[PDB]
Structures are given as C-alpha cells and as structure tokens.
C-alpha cells in the first residue's frame, strides 16, 4: 504494497535485463521508458500532442517486473522527462486507487 | 471506493459551488482546475516547464469535495487540458495505490 501519496510513487522495475526506477502514474494511459534496449519487433507511435508530437518505439507484450510483480504489457521507448508506468501496466499488476 | 485502472480514473468533485469532473493523477504533484471562480486570496505560480512555463493562480486551503470526501488543499486555477486532482489532494482524502 500500500503506497501513500505524500511522496512521488517511484518504484523499482526490471526491464530488458536492466534495473530502473519509474513513476506509478494513474494520469498516463501508456508506459514510457527511456534508455532501454528491448529485443524483438517495434513500430513507431506518436504520443503527447501539446506543441507537436513525440515519436516513440512501441513494443508489444513486453515482459516487465514492477515492484516484484512479473507482468506483460506494451512499453513505449523514447525520451521522457521521467520513466512512467501508465495505467496499461498498473492494470496488469492489479493496482487500484483506494480511499 | 476501490477504483480499477482499466479506464481513466475520472471522479466528480464539488469546488467553488460548482460540480466538475477531474482525473485522479498520481503523476501530478499539484491539483489544477480550469473554469472555477474561487473567492479569497491567490498568488501567481509558474508550473510545467516544458516549452516554457504556464502561469496559474494558487489558492491555498481551498475546501473541495472529491468523490464525497470533504477536504482542504491547495488548488491551482488556470487552463488545463484536463482537470487534475494531484497527490496534494489525494493525500487529504486518504487515497492510496494498492497491489
């Protein structure tokens, strides 16, 4: 786990053989990570949309471990001010908002 | 409630005598709402920082009801692509991430 929100909800993840940190972001539809070299197929995707769009590489069905939970989901790879775990992967780990 | 994340976590809020909807956004430090006329004192605040800054009005200790929970917190008022409830108000309502 139960994560209170007094601080930014940053968690450890394992992706593409690397250990990284990312922000659990319920405001983000998608997961965007930078500086990961993923194997297998990808397609370009345009995201954002304020001031223009940002092009990232979309990798589907990527195995990823998030705070000890081994799951699968789409990961967008490209430049991002902060590594973000979006709703698409929070659903996979069974993460809910509770109050 | 327990809110799953398959859809965007949009909730009803009551602010400044108006009913509005806003997104529960764990990636946002602050709460930003547009088209509200709040009474009492404010100061300008610069937020964002990508491409420049956005100037908003900071109102402290604003009474707000969020999905039935009457709380108090800082509300930034200015144009925002989507009304956002940030961590500052999620802590007030006792909202946690759970998995």
């Amino acid at each position: 786990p139960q994560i209170t929100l007094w601080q930014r909800p940053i968690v450890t993840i394992k992706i593409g053989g690397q250990l990284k940190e990312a922000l659990l972001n319920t405001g983000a539809d998608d997961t965007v990570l930078e500086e990961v070299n993923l194997p297998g197929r990808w397609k370009p995707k345009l995201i954002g949309g304020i001031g223009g769009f940002v092009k990232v590489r979309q990798y589907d069905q990527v195995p990823i471990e998030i705070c000890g939970h081994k799951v699968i989901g789409t990961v967008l790879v490209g430049p991002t001010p902060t590594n973000v775990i979006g709703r698409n992967l929070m659903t996979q780990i069974g993460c809910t908002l509770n109050f | 409630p327990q809110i799953t994340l398959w859809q965007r976590p949009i909730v009803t809020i009551k602010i400044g005598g108006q009913l509005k909807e806003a997104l529960l956004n764990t990636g946002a430090d602050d709460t930003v709402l547009e088209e509200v006329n709040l009474p009492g004192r404010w100061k300008p605040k610069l937020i964002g920082g990508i491409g420049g800054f956005v100037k908003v009005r900071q109102y402290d200790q604003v009474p707000i009801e969020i999905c039935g929970h009457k709380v108090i917190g800082t509300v930034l008022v200015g144009p925002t692509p989507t009304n956002v409830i940030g961590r500052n108000l999620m802590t007030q309502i006792g909202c946690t991430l759970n998995f």
Partner: peptide, 7 residues
C-alpha cells in the same frame, strides 16, 4: 511536476 496523457 504534473503528468497526465493521451496516447
């Protein structure tokens, strides 16, 4: 910071 998104 402050981070929503739409794909």
């Amino acid at each position: 910071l402050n981070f929503p998104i739409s794909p």
